């Protein structure tokens, strides 16, 4: 529908590629 | 947040770089 | 659970599966 | 860190939970 | 089945463990 | 829409992580 | 088709692509 | 909704598996 | 194109082979 | 099994089909 | 950006993330 | 090609952009 679970599954991988050594903080709430 | 911005609409590499440390 | 070496995106992927609504912090700084 | 425990070696589930918010 | 349960709504690790051998 | 194909693509990976040595039987019909 | 070593999730992924509506059984017990 | 971005993310991997040595040309416009 | 054919409806391996070189 | 044929060595398509239901 | 060896599907995945609407050509012929 | 530069060795971002259409 807008399945935020499967979408976040892609977002976290994209963030692992983009951030690199910096890392990132991920929260499924904003 | 990232989840209300990068799911309804696609986010580029530059937009995804905001949430990095 | 799986007993292997998770590396790369896979790492974060399992952090997405185990944590859930709690969220996770990802820092690969050795 | 996380890599040297779960990528260099093998992690369990409760070792995975140590990096959740 | 797994496909009518874990697509419309998200399934946790414990829910996904039911379908393991 | 509710694309059960892309969703099952994630489900099978999550099941590979969760089941581990046990394995799993997957059918896209219930 | 690709001629490489598929391992980890990738393995199941191709089982998801090749089988289809038939389904597959995944058992890594040596 | 029909999120062509996440769907193309799966399509490109499936194409990498299917084409193999041949390769493929991918464009998100037809 | 591939994107108007293999997103609304699923594409098999044979359908995906058309777009290979 | 499946790993020792397709992960330890390389599998073909018709060897992949041997594990479908 | 990440500083590692991308191989397999991962390769194309990053081509999907970096290029975008431009598109990419993928040929692994050595 | 692309593999011998980014898989055999490590690529940068602007080396990644060399394979975009
Ligand atoms: Cl999706
Ligand atoms: Cl890998
Ligand atoms: Zn998806
Ligand atoms: Zn991988």
Author numbering:
A (entry chain D), C (entry chain B), F (entry chain D), G (entry chain B), H (entry chain D), K (entry chain B): 1 to 30
B (entry chain C), D (entry chain A), E (entry chain C), I (entry chain C), J (entry chain A), L (entry chain A): 1 to 21
From the paper:
Insulin plays a critical role in regulating cellular glucose uptake. Insulin is primarily hexameric (consist of six identical monomer ~36 KDa) and dimeric (consist of two identical monomer ~12 KDa) during production, delivery, and circulation. Although it assembles into dimers and hexamers during its biosynthesis and storage, insulin is always active as a monomer. Serving as a pivotal model in the evolution and application of X-ray crystallographic techniques, the hexamer functions as a stable reservoir of the hormone within both the secretory granules of pancreatic β-cells and pharmaceutical formulations.
Finally, a 2.5 Å resolution X-ray crystal structure of its hexamer was determined through the newly developed multi-well X-ray crystallography technique of Turkish Light Source conducted at ambient temperature, elucidating the conformational differences between the hexamers of both INSv and IAsp. Molecular replacement with a dimer in the asymmetric unit facilitated the solution of the crystal structures of INSv insulin at pH 7.5. Specifically, amino acid residues 1–8 exhibited a “T” conformation in one monomer and an “R” conformation in the other with well-defined electron densities. The hexameric configuration of INSv is organized near a crystallographic 3-fold axis aligned with the central channel. However, unlike the IAsp structure, a distinct feature of the INSv hexamer in the R form involves the outward orientation of Asn3 in chain B relative to the interior of the channel. This spatial configuration leads to a less stable electrostatic interaction with the two symmetry-related AsnB3 residues. According to b-factor analysis from X-ray crystallography, significant mobility is observed up to the 26th residue in the R state form of INSv, which is clearly reflected in the H/D exchange map. The INSv analog demonstrated higher deuterium exchange compared to IAsp (after a 1440-minute reaction, n = 3), displaying a more kinetic conformation for INSv analog compared to IAsp, agreeing with the findings of B-factor of INSv crystal structure and DSC analysis.
